[PDB]
Amino acid sequence: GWGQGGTHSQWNKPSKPKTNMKHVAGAAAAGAVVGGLGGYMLGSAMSRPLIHFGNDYEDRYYRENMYRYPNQVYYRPVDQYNNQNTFVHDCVNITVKQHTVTTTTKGENFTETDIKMMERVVEQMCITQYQRESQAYY
Amino acid sequence: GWGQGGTHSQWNKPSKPKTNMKHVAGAAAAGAVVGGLGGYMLGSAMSRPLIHFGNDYEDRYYRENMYRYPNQVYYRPVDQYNNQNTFVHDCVNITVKQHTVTTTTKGENFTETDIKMMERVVEQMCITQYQRESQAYY
Amino acid sequence: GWGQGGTHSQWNKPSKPKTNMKHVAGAAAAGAVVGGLGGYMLGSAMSRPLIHFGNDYEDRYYRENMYRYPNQVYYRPVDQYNNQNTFVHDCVNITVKQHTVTTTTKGENFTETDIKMMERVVEQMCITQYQRESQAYY
Amino acid sequence: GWGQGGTHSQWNKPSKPKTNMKHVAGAAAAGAVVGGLGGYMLGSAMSRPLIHFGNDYEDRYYRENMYRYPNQVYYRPVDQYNNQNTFVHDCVNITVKQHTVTTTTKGENFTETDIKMMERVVEQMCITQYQRESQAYY
Amino acid sequence: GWGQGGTHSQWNKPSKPKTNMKHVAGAAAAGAVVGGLGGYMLGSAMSRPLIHFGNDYEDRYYRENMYRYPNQVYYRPVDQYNNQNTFVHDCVNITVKQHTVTTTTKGENFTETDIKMMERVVEQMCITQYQRESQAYY
């Protein structure tokens, strides 16, 4: 007539995490867990992987049992070329340019005029602004 | 007549996570879990994978049982070329350009005029703005 | 008639984490856990991996049992070429340029004019601004 | 009729962590734990990895049991070329340039004019500003 | 009828950590723990790794048991070339330049004018400013 107390356990219990950041790449933030027996596991081999939050009871009576390589993980990869990649390209290769190429041969008594006005061409770009009861003036 | 207390357990229990960020690539954020016995697992082999939140009871009586390689994971990949990739291209290869090519040969007594006015051409671009009771003036 | 007290345990219990940062790459921040028996594990092999928050009871009676290599991890990878990478490119290769190429051969009595006005061309770019009851004037 | 007191234990219990930083690369900050039996483990092999927050009871009676290499980790990788990398490129290769190339051969009695006005071209860039009841004037 | 008192133990218990910093690379800060039996462990092999916050009870009666290499870690890596690196590039290769190349051959009675005005071209860049009831004037 024994007794085990109930388990109220948290692998991650962050209370009121107020966080301001920009980039979360390959990481964990704002009270987040990257995988329980998992996550980013490109090549894996797990024998008898068990997750049970409930109570566990085992009453085992093993007699003369021949266990030959139980839960064996024969991890023998050959020439494994696997790609599981995350690519994020934001505002890349942005160009605001004015280019002029001049190739004049034996130009006599000639006038060359090259005017490239560039005014108020881009006022805003990639403005990741979060506003809450706020004001922004540009 | 024993007793096991009930389990109230959370792998991730974030309370009121207030977070501001821009990019979450290949990561975990805002109280999120990347996989329980899973996630981003391109090549995997799991024998008897079990998840049960409920209570577990086992009363095993094994006698003279021959278990030959139980739950065996024969992980032998050969020439595995697999691709599971996430590609995000936002506002990439954006060009605002004025280009002029001049190739004049023995130009005599000639006038060349090249005017490229560029005014108020792009006022806003890629403006990821979140507004809540706020004001923005451009 | 014994008794084990209930377990209220947290692997990470941060209370009110107020944090300001910019980049979280391959790390942990704001009270976040990178993996419980997991995370970023590209090549892994785990035999009998078990996670159970509940109480555990075991009553084992093993007699004359032949256990030959139980829970064996035969980790023998050959020529494993795997890629699980996170790429974040934000505001990369941004160019605001004015380029002029002049190639004049035996130019006699000629006038060359190259004017490239560049005014108010980019006012803002990559402005990751978080506003809460605040004001910004540009 | 014995008794074990309940365990209320935290691997990391930071209370009210108020932190200001810029970059968290391959590290831990703001009360965050990088992995419990995990984290950033590219090549791993763990036999019988067990995590249980609940109480553990074991009543083992092993008699004449032949355990040949139990929980054996045969970690023999050959030519393992694996890449699990986090790449963050923010505001890289940003160029604001004015370039002129002049190549004149036997230019006689000619006038060359090269004007490149550059005014108010970029006012702000990569401004990671967090505002709370604050004001910014540019 | 014995008794063991409950354990209320913390591997890291920082109370109200108020911290201001810039870079946390490959380190620990703001009351953060880098791994419990983990962290940044590129190549690892652990036999029977166990973490249990709950109470542990063991009543073992082993008689005539042949344990041949139990929990053996055969750590024999050959030609292991693995990369798990964190790369953070912020505001790198930023160039604000005015370059002129002059190559004149036997230029007779010619006027060369090269004007490159550069005014108010970049007002702010990489301004990682955290504001709380504050004011900034530029």
Residue numbers in the entry:
A (entry chain B), B (entry chain D), C (entry chain A), D (entry chain C), E (entry chain E): 92 to 229
Please quote the authors directly.
Chronic wasting disease (CWD) is an incurable, fatal infectious prion disease that is found in cervid species including deer, elk, moose, and reindeer. Here we report a 2.8 Å cryo-EM structure of CWD prion fibrils from brain tissue of a naturally infected white-tailed deer (Odocoileus virginianus). Like recently solved rodent-adapted scrapie prion fibrils, our atomic model of CWD fibrils contains single stacks of PrP molecules forming parallel in-register intermolecular β-sheets and intervening loops comprising major N- and C-terminal lobes within the fibril cross-section. However, CWD fibrils from a natural cervid host differ markedly from the rodent structures in many other features, including a ~ 180° twist in the relative orientation of the lobes.
Using helical reconstruction, we obtained an overall resolution of 2.8 Å for the CWD fibril core. We used the final reconstructed 3D density map to build an atomic model of the CWD fibril using the PrP polypeptide sequence of residues 92–229, a span of residues consistent with the known protease-resistant core of the CWD prion. As with the structures of the known rodent-adapted prions, the CWD fibril cross-section comprised a single PrP molecule with major N- and C-terminal lobes (called N- and C-lobes, respectively). We have defined major motifs comprising the N-lobe as the E motif (in reference to its shape), hammer loop (also shape), and central strand, while the C-lobe contains the disulfide arch and C-arch. The N-lobe of the CWD fibril was quite distinct from those of the rodent-adapted prions, both in the complex convolutions of the polypeptide backbone and in the ~ 180° rotation relative to the C-lobe within the plane of each rung. The β-strands (β1 and β7) in the more C-terminal portion of the central strand were terminated by a salt bridge formed between residues D181 and K113 (the only buried lysine of the CLC). The individual rungs of the CWD fibril were not entirely coplanar, which created a staggered interface between the N- and C-lobes formed by residues 109–113 in the N-lobe, and 219–223 in the C-lobe. At its base, the CWD fibril contained a disulfide bond between C182 and C217, which was surrounded by a patch of hydrophobic residues. The overall shape and width of the CWD disulfide arch were most similar to that of the murine wild-type and anchorless (a) RML strains.
